[PDB]
Design a protein around this ligand. Sequence first.
Ligand SMILES: *[C@@H]1O[C@H](CO)[C@@H](O[C@@H]2O[C@H](CO)[C@@H](O[C@@H]3O[C@H](CO)[C@@H](O)[C@H](O)[C@@H]3O)[C@H](O)[C@H]2NC(C)=O)[C@H](O)[C@H]1NC(C)=O
Ligand SMILES: *[C@@H]1O[C@H](CO)[C@@H](O[C@@H]2O[C@H](CO)[C@@H](O)[C@H](O)[C@H]2NC(C)=O)[C@H](O)[C@H]1NC(C)=O
Ligand SMILES: *[C@@H]1O[C@H](CO)[C@@H](O)[C@H](O)[C@H]1NC(C)=O
Lengths: 49, 43, 47, 31
Amino acid sequence: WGHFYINGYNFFSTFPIDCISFNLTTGASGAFWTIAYTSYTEALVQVEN
Amino acid sequence: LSVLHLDSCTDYNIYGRTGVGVIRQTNSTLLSGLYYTSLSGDL
Amino acid sequence: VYDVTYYRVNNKNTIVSNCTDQCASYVDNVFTTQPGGLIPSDFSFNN
Amino acid sequence: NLIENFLLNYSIRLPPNSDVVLGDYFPTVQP
Ligand SMILES: *[C@@H]1O[C@H](CO)[C@@H](O[C@@H]2O[C@H](CO)[C@@H](O[C@@H]3O[C@H](CO)[C@@H](O)[C@H](O)[C@@H]3O)[C@H](O)[C@H]2NC(C)=O)[C@H](O)[C@H]1NC(C)=O
Ligand SMILES: *[C@@H]1O[C@H](CO)[C@@H](O[C@@H]2O[C@H](CO)[C@@H](O)[C@H](O)[C@H]2NC(C)=O)[C@H](O)[C@H]1NC(C)=O
Ligand SMILES: *[C@@H]1O[C@H](CO)[C@@H](O)[C@H](O)[C@H]1NC(C)=O
């Protein structure tokens, strides 16, 4: 729906999005990361700090 | 504008939240969020 | 090989060492997805 | 030591001054 969340906060938004193109790398740093494709659900979440 | 007066009593408007208080820099770390409030709704 | 294994590499001195316990709890951010699309109860949620 | 040597070649691409943790489908020790 165009909402961009950074570190959990909705800092900005755009028009609804059908497709997102991207090309991201850490390069020589040798760092790893993940991309997750998710859906909304109700859950009980315990938060600390 | 973003004029912030520290270590003194000020009339603030922070990301839409207004009130009177003393704002100080802390050495704490919180990774998530932009602002934090109390159970009463206060900043 | 079915999954991801982590090793620490120190190039200051290259020294390769195992990362299996306390350090594995700071960088391991990957998991097997359970049926239904559920995140395992032992996931760290670091990022 | 065969696994160690693998990591020694794999890590050649790293910067001259770094401490990193590498994660991949590396050869393992049990199976
Ligand atoms: C993304 O950045 C975070 C930090 O913002 C990285 O997490 C950090 O990981 C290091 C280990 O690589 C942790 O250091 C440890 O500190 C304790 C001090 O008690 C020491 O005993 C351990 O031996 C080790 O030196 C550090 O605490 C940790 N910081 C966190 C969790 O905020 C994270 O690894 C980075 N991302 C990726 C993909 O690597
Ligand atoms: C928010 O943090 C930034 C970054 O540290 C502050 O910007 C610096 O303020 C000092 C003091 O006047 C300047 O000398 C630096 O040049 C500023 N850095 C940059 C990149 O502009 C900013 O003042 C803080 N915001 C508030 C409202 O205090
Ligand atoms: C912040 O500074 C105080 C000293 O006023 C110190 O006691 C406290 O441990 C520090 N906290 C952090 C996270 O550095």
